[PDB]
Amino acid sequence: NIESGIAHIRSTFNNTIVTITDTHGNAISWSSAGALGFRGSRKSTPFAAQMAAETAAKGSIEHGLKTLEVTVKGPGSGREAAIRALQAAGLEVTAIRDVTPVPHNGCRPPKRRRV
Template sequence: MGKKRIIQKTKEELIKEREQIDAAVGKEPRTGSGRHQVLGARIYISSSYNNTLMTLCDNKGNTISQVSAGEGSSRGYSAIRSLAARGLEIDRLKDMTPIPHNGCRRPKVRRV
């Protein structure tokens, strides 16, 4: 079994590495291009027991923004009411709840 060699960096290498780290940390974070006007869009609201997701898409289906309300959030109907109260014009609503059409067989009833 051989011995493991530990390579130690020189002072110049340590200084150069530190300058690279400082340069990377000092940069401003990149942000989006700012606000832009969207004439027609769709909002998809996915509401579960634990969370409410709202996705804003343009008419082509490209996602513009996405928001998660987190735990303890308002549910789907409350989210729609809050959007309408803020002046959003609602054209149509569609319930996309999955409904089984005689899919999987249900388990047998337990007999005790």
């Protein structure tokens, strides 16, 4: 029953993560995009981000979690709503991380969709 923990913001066009883990990155409860029986486009809404974040928060409160250190890693779709949901309990976002390649074209990305 651990006091402190982490969550991990990493946002794209329509993908975001924020799982509830311990200080050393051992998991406890998890939040990332959906998880909650939502499907399709509803899954990527800001609303559905809240309900995923609440459900992982209320999972971790039962493990005696009081505070959540969260990261920063660019803007995206439903990142702000996911934080608002977590501020039911209350917490901080101190760290700032990144998912970027130090080469433009480190690995070659997949081809542009013709739509």
